[PDB]
Amino acid sequence: KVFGRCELAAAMKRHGLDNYRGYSLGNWVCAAKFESNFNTQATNRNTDGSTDYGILQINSRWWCNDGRTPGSRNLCNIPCSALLSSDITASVNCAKKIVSDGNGMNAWVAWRNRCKGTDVQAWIRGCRL
Template sequence: MRSVLIISLLSCFFAVYNAKVFSKCDLARKLKAHGMDGFHGYSLANWVCMAQYESNFNTRALNGKNANGSADYGIFQLNNKWWCNDNKHSSANACNIMCSKFLDDNIDDDIICAKRVVRDPNGMSAWVAWQNHCKSKDLSKYLASCKL
């Protein structure tokens, strides 16, 4: 039993240790390369601002404490009730992907799903952090020091 506990603790440490945390400029470059600047009318700064407040740019961010029992995954905190399947809860799985894919360092699939999210009528308002911290704000500081 003791060895199981030690292995579990070490694997948690390894997962956190291997998390990729983007700088805002590195994330902006990646998002721009994937056509996010202006996607469905949202500037690149909106995406960077949202990612900062949702995950602090951490690809392994996991929030399992939503009031409705759902969880949010990855750099964009994509929800398991609507966007991905975690095999634990009922899900619309609109992005047709396992939630665990949003916890790796390759954010290409996260970006594809985020694009799917904003195509819905709520747009970026699907992210509460974007509504509270980014919507209708001067976001110039998010890209000011980036050489895009």
């Protein structure tokens, strides 16, 4: 499923992301934009044999099990296929685990280079939330 901007802001808000570990709703919407263009079915294969899954492009090496990645740690305790549902819940729950660590949202390369330090509140402007 490809989410509208405001539809996504709503679902993320509903799932408890606003100000989660100090990151405002706009940071999360901006991350999803540049990671996946709001597409829940986005996939991207990597060199090391791993794959990034779903709306926030979460990687199979540490965070989810796809059965195709050597030494997967599955820290979010989910099959990577869960990250490809039209329902964003699994991606949010995994994102919460990822962001709770020292690296914060810096774990997401596209957030770090496109959203970090910008006027991210713009990403929820217009939305009735």
